[PDB]
Design a protein around this ligand. Structure first.
Ligand SMILES: Cc1[nH]c2ccccc2c1CC(=O)N[C@@H](Cc1ccccc1)C(=O)N(C)c1ccccc1
Ligand SMILES: Cc1[nH]c2ccccc2c1CC(=O)N[C@@H](Cc1ccccc1)C(=O)N(C)c1ccccc1
Ligand SMILES: Cc1[nH]c2ccccc2c1CC(=O)N[C@@H](Cc1ccccc1)C(=O)N(C)c1ccccc1
Ligand SMILES: Cc1[nH]c2ccccc2c1CC(=O)N[C@@H](Cc1ccccc1)C(=O)N(C)c1ccccc1
Ligand SMILES: Cc1[nH]c2ccccc2c1CC(=O)N[C@@H](Cc1ccccc1)C(=O)N(C)c1ccccc1
Ligand SMILES: Cc1[nH]c2ccccc2c1CC(=O)N[C@@H](Cc1ccccc1)C(=O)N(C)c1ccccc1
Lengths: 215, 215, 215, 215, 215, 215
């Protein structure tokens, strides 16, 4: 990644085994459960495009997902190139060239060029731009592997209300890949006895009040 | 988080895998037992609002609680906006804008803006302000999931006094979410033989003396 | 905690997950065995009162002990206030105020005030003062939960002398909470055959010589 | 490895136990699965040729592979020598000599000479050059130990489409040692019912659309 | 411990959880096997007397040994006082006082005084002096708990020679607490067939040659 | 070890628990398998003779090997003394003395003297010189405990060729203690069917081609 030293200047630092192992284990344990995405984002703080490819490459399984991610990346890179065409022809000696989609994705750029872009003034944050493309793809994957529709999350006749609400909002989080946009459907899919207590609370009950009322 | 360097200046530093993993495991092992809250506070030392959202987002389960936390956060942010309205209209070029509730909660502010607020002179400590809102919500959650009333903590006929006092004050801590405001109820809920020894100690016995007397 | 930087100046540093986890696990594994106390003291090197409360708060169980510790802390703070009354009335603008017991225990002081006291010249070491109060309380707890009197530590008819001496001095350490003030009682509680060998050594035998003689 | 200090200058640093252990465990757990290669590359960030030999040498098993790697290294070093012959005869006192293949592979050069090359201006990046040779060899090994042809990856009659796509692209990755150059063969090797749905999608369906259509 | 900073000056640093845990686990796993002593010495690199007491205090069991260690420490401190008597009477304002045995053992000195001695010019290395006393005691303990005499280490009729030599020199190391001062007794305690081969080698065979000859 | 600081100067640093534990576990898990040697060399990067003795001393078992290592060390030290005799008589006040074999092995030199030699200009690298002696001894040990001759490594009638080549080169590595100096013996010890395929390849087949041909 790029971090600041005591100069205090922005410099490249090797990705640590600590970070590498964290990401590998998160994927191993959690697959594409939505809470994997914020972990990816935090572990890749300050990442160059090279670092981002490294993390993605250390994933052993899930190659269907990874191919879908590649397809999303290529789509975003094509759109980058539409929005910001780069001038062909030889570039000026010693000068910084403009990055195209493939440079941002780190397929056609060197680490040194990536470093140059990220630390220039003003900087071209190719690491942040590539990370956004990756998260866009990962969100699609989280939504694809979400196994259940919110419409099938209904409270069991013997299920405690809190356990039902946990399933409901966990399902909501995956179906929406942790992006916000509920109250009524939650009451509707409650079991008969809880639904009765809830309807009699009136509209605008907080979740706290609902869980209290059905405890 | 924000830490000081050797300049020695306040600078942003990436959240470490060590911290990320600690928080994830604490929640996994302890749920919303009250001692989870001080762990959250210590692990989030120097946190930006982005860092705080990261930690909250890496929690996989407990989505009922998390939605309750969101509702508490939105309440505190609405109140912030009532107390400190921000001036609409274009802000002055190159100047720091005023944060509203959603900026403090990190929903509508960038990391760079958060950094600017936290390191300004005088600083606007948006990380500390957001952490207070979060702890307020987490305390509500700790109190909700407290499974037992202090009124049902009574010493078993064969239960050692120390084991009874452990249950009593552990229950007290959850019911009050580790916030202070006892002696008499502790004696009242003691078993017959211990209660006898305790009553004969008179008022104002220290807990030490009570546990000694019933050992 | 407070540590020195390369300026090299005394600055506040966040408590590390490494330290937090160490303390939590020590208590989990060892309860209030006496060797827990020196571990507490070493893990809390350079601690502010805030850090000390953090460590104490991350303890999940043992709430009878923790309440006894609170009572000891309040006693020491009352005595601090007797010895060093603070002047009421508004304090001088921009000036350091005097800490009372509750400030030292970190109940009524901010981290910034604690930092100010600890780094002032001359410093008021509120972290060290609070740590002493805590260790005073923890020592009482170690002594309370000591399950056996030294008078009941007697060598088994088939127990090796070394195993008996281990139990004897381990019991002594708890009963005295690792504070020093023996030879004769150790011989007295030895089994018949070992006691015979020991009596014939005469007074002033070193433990080494005693263990050699009964090996 | 070589890293920059606060001068901020390029200096040699000892390889850490953290890195050494990471590499050893990766090989132990994963053999020559393709995701091992990017892990090698990241763990060897900034590596001297000495560091690269160290990592390769700490591998205990897989000695057939290691001998194949040696043969690849010797081939690349022979080619280096063809392209960049070094002048025989005594070199100038105090001056940097030219590296030949065996110096780059660290068989005939000292750590001090390697350091000199890597930090000279302009530098001769012998660590990066040697790493490329090693990855070239490791890629051959990954391809050799790939147990299955893509032609034998066909969807089971009861196999979920996603599970089939995972096997297909994982096989592709090994057979090609994680180097890119598919859609049609993936449809062809699908089972009858999925193939029907897929053919009726028309050409140019994204993988996302295909997996959606066969879910 | 005391380490140098970038000033680069000798400063006090808190003992790390890493070090604390290492020592605790070494004792837990290895007891007073001789290889425990060099581990103690290395883990206590740069230790103040306070740090040394900390490490000794975190040992939970083995209290017979610890009392023997205390007795050895008191003996060395008495001898220090004989060799270097300290002048009674009030010491000069602001000046460094002379350490007596109890100051070196850290029973009657503060951390600040210990720091002063260790960093003075010329320094009085109270940490190194105390460590020597401790190792002297630990060596006595290693020798006491050595369960077997070298005279009872004889090669089994079916025991491989290498396995016999391992037991022989491991026994030697404990009986001598890893202090050097053999060839003949090793041959004498060999089994009949190996002894025959060995006698016919003549005097002055290296161990290598002996183990080769009896393989 | 000796490392450079930010001055940036060569200074002594305590050996870390991380390093100490790594070495101890490597020996525990791997004995004197050849890949242990490069691990020793890397873990002892920058080591003083004191550090080298520390690492060797933390090994609990294998005392036959350790005594053989001592004998090798004494041989190398005797030869050092033959090549570089040191002048007897009192050395000049404040001046650096010449190291003899026992100083390099750290038996008769202090840490301060070792530091002086290693950081002098020009330096006398006593750590590197001692490490070479140790590796020379360890290599002898690896060769001694090699359980099998390359002449007994023959392909099983049902053994896959790759599994045979793994055993062959692993045996070669131990018998030669990871020092290079094969093709023909590998074919000769192949099973009948593989030998046939191999002979018909002609001389000069690469191992890659051989393993391909017998897959
Ligand atoms: C955890 C989560 N569960 C969801 C369910 C449906 C849709 C989205 C989600 C999310 C992501 C989610 O909303 N995470 C929160 C952080 C958070 C997590 C947990 C509790 C409180 C705050 C977040 O990133 N931001 C920016 C946020 C902060 C405060 C209020 C609203 C949003
Ligand atoms: C641990 C705890 N148990 C409780 C039971 C009921 C109500 C609250 C609690 C708490 C939180 C609790 O009170 N924690 C203590 C720290 C502490 C923890 C454990 C022992 C001693 C001191 C705390 O944060 N402060 C500021 C404090 C310090 C000294 C005296 C009183 C309060
Ligand atoms: C370990 C311990 N066991 C005891 C039994 C009864 C009473 C007290 C104790 C103690 C605490 C105990 O005495 N710990 C020792 C350190 C120590 C620990 C173990 C062996 C040697 C030195 C200590 O803190 N100090 C200041 C000390 C140092 C040297 C001599 C005497 C005291
Ligand atoms: C993971 C992988 N699976 C493959 C299957 C067949 C052939 C090659 C591969 C690879 C290596 C592979 O292609 N890894 C990717 C990084 C990556 C990994 C996973 C998902 C998305 C991006 C990579 O290194 N680069 C430079 C890249 C980046 C974006 C688009 C295309 C290539
Ligand atoms: C390991 C050990 N085994 C022994 C058996 C009997 C007596 C003493 C011992 C020792 C302690 C032991 O001798 N350790 C060695 C270091 C060492 C350890 C292992 C192999 C080679 C060198 C040591 O500390 N020094 C100073 C030393 C160095 C070279 C030659 C002779 C001595
Ligand atoms: C791993 C190893 N196996 C052997 C079998 C017989 C004899 C020696 C060995 C060795 C030690 C061995 O040769 N290790 C290699 C490093 C290495 C390890 C593994 C694969 C490729 C390169 C080494 O140290 N050097 C200097 C080297 C580098 C390139 C070519 C030839 C030698």
């Amino acid at each position: 990644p790029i971090v600041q030293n005591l100069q205090g200047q922005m410099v490249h630092q090797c990705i640590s085994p600590r970070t590498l192992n964290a990401w590998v284990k998160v994927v191993e344990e959690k697959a594409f459960s939505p809470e994997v995405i914020p972990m990816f984002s935090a572990l890749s703080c300050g990442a160059t495009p090279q670092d981002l490819n490294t993390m993605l490459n250390t994933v052993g399984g899930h190659q269907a997902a990874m191919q879908m991610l590649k397809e999303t990346i290529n789509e975003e890179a094509a759109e980058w190139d539409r929005l910001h065409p780069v001038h062909a022809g030889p570039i000026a000696p010693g000068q910084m060239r403009e990055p195209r989609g493939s440079d941002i994705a780190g397929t056609t750029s060197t680490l040194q060029e990536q470093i140059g872009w990220m630390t220039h003034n003003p900087p071209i944050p190719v690491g942040e731009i590539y990370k956004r493309w990756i998260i866009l793809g990962l969100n699609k994957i989280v939504r694809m592997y979400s196994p259940t529709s919110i419409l099938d999350i209904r409270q069991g006749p013997k299920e405690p209300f809190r356990d039902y609400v946990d399933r409901f909002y966990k399902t909501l989080r995956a179906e929406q890949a942790s992006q916000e946009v509920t109250e009524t459907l939650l009451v509707q899919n409650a079991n008969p006895d809880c639904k009765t207590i809830l309807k009699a609370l009136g509209p605008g009950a907080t979740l706290e009040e609902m869980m209290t009322a059905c405890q």
